[PDB]
Subunit: 262 residues, 6 copies
Amino acid sequence: MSCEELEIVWNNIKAEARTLADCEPMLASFYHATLLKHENLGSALSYMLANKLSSPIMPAIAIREVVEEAYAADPEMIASAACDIQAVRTRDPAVDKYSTPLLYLKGFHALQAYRIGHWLWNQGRRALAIFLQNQVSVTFQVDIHPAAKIGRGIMLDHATGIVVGETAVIENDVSILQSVTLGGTGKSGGDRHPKIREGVMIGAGAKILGNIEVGRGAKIGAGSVVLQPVPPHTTAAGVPARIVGKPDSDKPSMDMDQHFNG
Amino acid sequence: MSCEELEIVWNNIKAEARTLADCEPMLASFYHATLLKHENLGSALSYMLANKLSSPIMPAIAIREVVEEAYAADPEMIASAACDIQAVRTRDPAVDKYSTPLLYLKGFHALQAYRIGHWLWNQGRRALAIFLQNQVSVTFQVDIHPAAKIGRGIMLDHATGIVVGETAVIENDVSILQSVTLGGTGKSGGDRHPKIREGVMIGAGAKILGNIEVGRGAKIGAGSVVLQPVPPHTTAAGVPARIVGKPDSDKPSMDMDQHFNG
Amino acid sequence: MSCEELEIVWNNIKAEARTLADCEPMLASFYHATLLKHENLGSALSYMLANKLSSPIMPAIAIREVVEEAYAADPEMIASAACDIQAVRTRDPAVDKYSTPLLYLKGFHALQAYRIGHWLWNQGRRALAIFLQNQVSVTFQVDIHPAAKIGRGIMLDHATGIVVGETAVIENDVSILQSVTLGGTGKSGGDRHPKIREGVMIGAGAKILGNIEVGRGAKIGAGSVVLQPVPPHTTAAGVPARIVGKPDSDKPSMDMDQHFNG
Amino acid sequence: MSCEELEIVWNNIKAEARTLADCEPMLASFYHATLLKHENLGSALSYMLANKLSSPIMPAIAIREVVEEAYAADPEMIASAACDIQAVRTRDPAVDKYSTPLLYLKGFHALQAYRIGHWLWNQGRRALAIFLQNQVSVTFQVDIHPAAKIGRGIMLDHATGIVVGETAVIENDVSILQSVTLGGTGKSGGDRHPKIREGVMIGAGAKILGNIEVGRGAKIGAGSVVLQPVPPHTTAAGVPARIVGKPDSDKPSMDMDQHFNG
Amino acid sequence: MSCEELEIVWNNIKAEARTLADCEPMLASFYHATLLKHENLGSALSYMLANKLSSPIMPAIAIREVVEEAYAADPEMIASAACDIQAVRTRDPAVDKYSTPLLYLKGFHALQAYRIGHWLWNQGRRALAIFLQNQVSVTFQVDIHPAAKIGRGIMLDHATGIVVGETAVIENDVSILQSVTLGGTGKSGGDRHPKIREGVMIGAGAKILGNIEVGRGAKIGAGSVVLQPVPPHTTAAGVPARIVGKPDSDKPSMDMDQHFNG
Amino acid sequence: MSCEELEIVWNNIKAEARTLADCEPMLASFYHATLLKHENLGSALSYMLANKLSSPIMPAIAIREVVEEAYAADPEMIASAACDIQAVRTRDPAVDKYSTPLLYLKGFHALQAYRIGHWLWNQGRRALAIFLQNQVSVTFQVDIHPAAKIGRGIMLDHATGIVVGETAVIENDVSILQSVTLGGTGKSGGDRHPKIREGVMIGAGAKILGNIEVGRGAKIGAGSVVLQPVPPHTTAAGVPARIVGKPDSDKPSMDMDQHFNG
């Protein structure tokens, strides 16, 4: 995601937004406020997060300032958001616009919310990070610990019931569905959550528990319970999971083939 | 659901409401506003939908005109709601009143909200339909794509975590529990979601993926991951699912027998 | 939980609040209003529940009086909340403070909301109870029927998607994760939901269906579908689940070992 | 105001609305919802009243049914609003559009809210009428008792601080400014408030107290304190007021000449 | 106002509240929450103030606690409220119930709000007192400096535009109408506001400016500008005011005779 | 007002905020969000206006961008606000802090809201301006037409009931109290509202009507009705007003002597 490519995803969002105002006069001012009035993705993201997260405790106007402070300090979060937008648009056939994730999709919203909380956590502002984690769980039904380390090009399609714990890692170009847990084991601190490598697809309802590897290009079948490491470019399925095949592609996250004969 | 039988469902709802208002002074005014003031199920329904889906982006008062416009153009939607209410009351032992689904049950609300989104989608108002889909996902935790084709006499019991994709079909007299996915596969458009035929029961947490058929009178056991077509009058269970038996009834959606040995 | 132990968990929460106010100025007035201004747990709980259960139909101020009346009639509900705070702090390595469950964790909030609903249900105020049940489902994504009998020292970790039905029993010192169903079967009323005995641990996404026992100190593996009774001190896993071993502790709810194999 | 002339006021409002929506993207959706979606003045009016009077005690959606019920039973109220709109547009040089009073002018809103309160009062719904009176006083700063009898073609320009008591009469084609009191005297019931006849203009801050007559075509100067009857076609001014002259027009309410030397 | 008389005004409010729930089913839960559920006037007052004053800055639940703390420390404020209620009921013929001021009348609400701010001011909590003064000005359109000293048996009828400054004093049994200013002069601190003695009636729009006496039993005519002391049992009127008569009663505040021939 | 004087009033406001946070813990996060988190007046103003102008039609976050665009185009509006803060602090003995006008005083809030409306009005965004005009009237009870030309160093003390019309002019260093009308005459447009020149003081409830001059350093007595021009350095009072004397200062707006006689 280069500076020029960033400006193209933003230009495509704007172009679409013009169409949308003309399609739905009841949302025209909504499209104007969220998209058309903004000159870059960062301003559109801070607007969305501020309004979605908002509460009596913390108004949208206050939140936006924290968000904008995060993005000034680490503008790469904006670029990660762009890659997440492209991932949804290319991988999800129900989404044919760049603007749709930004406008509507709770998984995209929760992902960008996590990035703010993560930045806050790393700055030492943990109380606020933990508040936001739990507000995002109630509001968007996605529960991501702010100490998790999550890359870019991530799709959280549908997203309700996703849980990602404190020591999890998710690398770039990972596709995760509703009700996926990357969960802990034990009652002690320490490394205890999954390590999800690049290219991995995880079907709806998968539980992956403990400090275990899911290697690059692996496919986790829907409804699996994964208790042991999954080798790269392998397909795991069942309760508990065992290796049952190998994906037909190097990066199953890009193709979303939900079959697990293989 | 004839026009006479509709008026009897409505008359029962009102009769229940009077008793409810006399017993719970904190909710007397809520019962009056939602039920005792309306002269038909349609008005009560637009009321409930407008109030529950209300947001700063679109207020109750605006939502309601959209709902009433849809009901005027396709009054069968109101009949469909009435059947959905009877489905819940007869199939769910936790419900002993026609008023309960209408007042409180988020799966019932999500289902009627889907109906409005589907009507909008079909008229060409896709942008509003997609907005409402995702509003419904955040508020009721049910994510139903508005292009899904869903019949009547449907129960969505508990409902949190339900996902029904763009090309799904659900025929009449189907019962579905919490965390059920009628999900897609692949990254291209076109039919890629299940077709659930009449009489089918789907237990909690079942995942049915792809353009596969679940035949009439079939039972899908809780926690199943169904990747292949399920023949009529069969029971499927497992990760991945296989045919394990046959239901004791012609329409397992009616009796809610969660056992799978058949 | 005695009166002096109650007062100490409260003292701990207050001390933690002082620090929290000092280190996050955006939240200072929040910590002050939730924690610092109160002289006991009960008063902090009513505050939290009032604000979290608040809606157009019932504002915080009116809810609070209901909570306070319940707590004056049954002070053991405050003590049960204490035990639930301890349960979380000791069992959940993501949690290192007494105040965290109270301030933030929706499973803890939903559990205490259920207590109020259960109290109302046993007073004959069933309409109010069912209304709160379904509100808690929409707002915290936890659906517990107020006639469920649930003990103390309970953790609902993450919690999204939890469903507990009408005739369920959960005894003391039980740990339950996201997307756990204690669910029914059949369309007739009467006893039909699980009896989960003391010390049980239930992992993510487990469905336990019917009026079946899960014996003391049992362990239910993540993703299991339990259709048959599970003996005391035994581990069940699979779809459908079978006995696969015995836990390494007497009360697996306290240790949270998600491994099954043993 | 015939039924043909009403439709022309409405058609002009809609024509204005289209231009307004094209010029101000932040308000495009507001114009659409308030004006362009309605097919008559009555729907637009119930919309505006429901939204503006909305409170936690009574929401917009509930207010609107009350308003629409009143308009169905006494459609002349809608004609009265249409005349009040023409009054403002023709008499107030700051208004050059029929849409302006309906969209923005709190004196216009307060006056139509009075009409609903008066209808309720007359049917026997006094408790609701008194609630709305005082809600209107807090929200629009106009306090009109619902038993007041107020005709049509009335302008309440600026309107803050207007008080019209229980037994007041205001005939057709009267114009009243900010901080005008049509007030009582004494501590007993019965007629004790002014009777303002047709054509009368009342300047800012005038106080008219007791059951006294202000005759047709009379002008009351700004700041007057009128304790005694004012003859038709006369001008009164002073503290206390005396007859100082005679107006230049037959109906000073039409021309708004604030000068008092006559 | 004795302890027994306090219990009688409260009993009358309760009796009326029963009638009202039966008269208006849309407000029945409102009457239940505000009046019927409370066992004394103090609890009903703290409820009303908390909900009316409420804002994003300070929620109703937080405010109620401050209010209740004020009333514990100085229960005489409750008794003053009772006398203010009786004053409205006896002096205002538009009000025939004890409950009406408590439920609806913004002047009564602003008066009781001032008592809280005044208690706060005297405790040294001036920042909060000044915040509430200005919130009451926006919300109820009454602007009373918290350092003002105001007695009991006060009626603020209609109340919009009332201003009472920092060094004002208002004794018991005073009746003040809309748009009355008890105002300052100069830009220096020090005594500079009116001293209104017992029994005084002040008509709508009167301005009384500077540190001047309005002696017991005096009558200030509507629309007067009073720049010099008014002797006891005298009637002042005009701009500027001069003595023009003497009231027909010892305590013109009780009779509300608005005439000023005398 | 130079750039260094601006920065000092800001420094004063911040220092005052530190103290205010320390002494009222309920408001600490409030003071922090309004004052402490900002680096300049302009940014604190946009925050305050966004939050105070916020509504369902236009949320705080969108309003704020409008305010910021106005301030970037015309930075002198920030400097005018500074001057207005000083005006209040120096002229109003109830005010001893720079932060008080900014945090609390609705006249100061309404004045800066007018500045935004005036800027929008001169950009051709007249519909938005008129919408904000009428919102400010409902919310702060101040009705200023956005085409009014108003200078800097203005105090609107108390402010409820102020009306300023379309063609009014208010020059620098003018002081105006509650219930002042600068009002029009006639039903034709064109110039028809007062021209209030530098240094004028206008007391409570004065009405000044028509396109008439009120000359520099004049004093308008409370309750006056001014229908004829008022020479520079002259005092007008009465209904209707006449010249009664000459003020004791050059700019009576600075000294606030409400006496008239001289």
